[PDB]
């Protein structure tokens, strides 16, 4: 049963790192990163806390530090999750006027072709203390 290369698992944006002790959350209408090449319909998705698979020879540790990555709705590791679905490590965000449809046309990033774009939030967004974009 032939198998092709796995679908790209990288977020288009840099990490939102939890450098403090606050739990990640956003007010309703906030959280979606800036993407000038996306429509109002596309402004919806989730932050997913990065999980550990196979990075640890001497460590069996990686970076104890929590890192959260944004994925548009219907894309990434939780592509099959509907908006609002409750899961530890998933935070849902949506701008006003967003459409509840998969953003397959944006999809995910392939690191071998494109670099991550710096995660930027609109001016005056309420971000919890200790969270910083990388
Ligand atoms: Zn940092
Ligand atoms: Zn679009």
Residue numbers in the entry: 41 to 174
From the paper:
One central protein involved in the formation of regulatory ribonucleoprotein complexes (RNP) is the coronaviral structural protein nucleocapsid (N). N plays a major role in RNA genome replication, translation, and packaging and has further been found to interfere with host-integrated stress responses and stress granule formation. The N-NTD possesses a peculiar, hand-like three-dimensional fold, with a β-sheet palm and several flexible loops, arranged as fingers around the central β-sheet. The latter, together with the extraordinarily long basic β-hairpin finger, constitutes the positively charged primary RNA-binding surface.
We have recently reported that mutation of serine 105, located at the interface of the β-hairpin and the N-loop, to isoleucine, results in more sophisticated changes in the NTD RNA-binding behavior. Slightly more distant from the palm region, des_mutant S105I interferes with the ability of NTD to selectively recognize RNA target elements, likely caused by an impaired contact between β-hairpin residue S105 and the N-loop residue Q58. In contrast, the S105 mutation exhibits more local affects, comprising the β-hairpin and the N-loop, in line with the mutation site located outside the core network. Consequently, and different from Q58I, the melting temperature of S105I is not affected, but remains WT-like. To unravel the structural basis of network-disrupting mutations, we solved the 2.2 Å and 2.0 Å crystal structures of Q58I and S105I, respectively. The comparison of our WT structure to Q58I and S105I reveals a strongly deformed β-hairpin (basic finger) for both mutants. This is reflected by high RMSD values of 4.552 Å and 3.198 Å for Q58I and S105I with the WT, respectively. Most importantly, while we find the β-hairpin architecture to be significantly altered in both mutants, the core network remains intact in S105I. This observation fits the WT-like melting temperature observed for S105I. Our crystal structures of Q58I and S105I show a strongly impaired arrangement of the extruding basic finger and a loss of its β-hairpin character. Both mutants lack the capacity to specifically recognize target RNA yet retain the general capacity to bind RNA non-specifically.
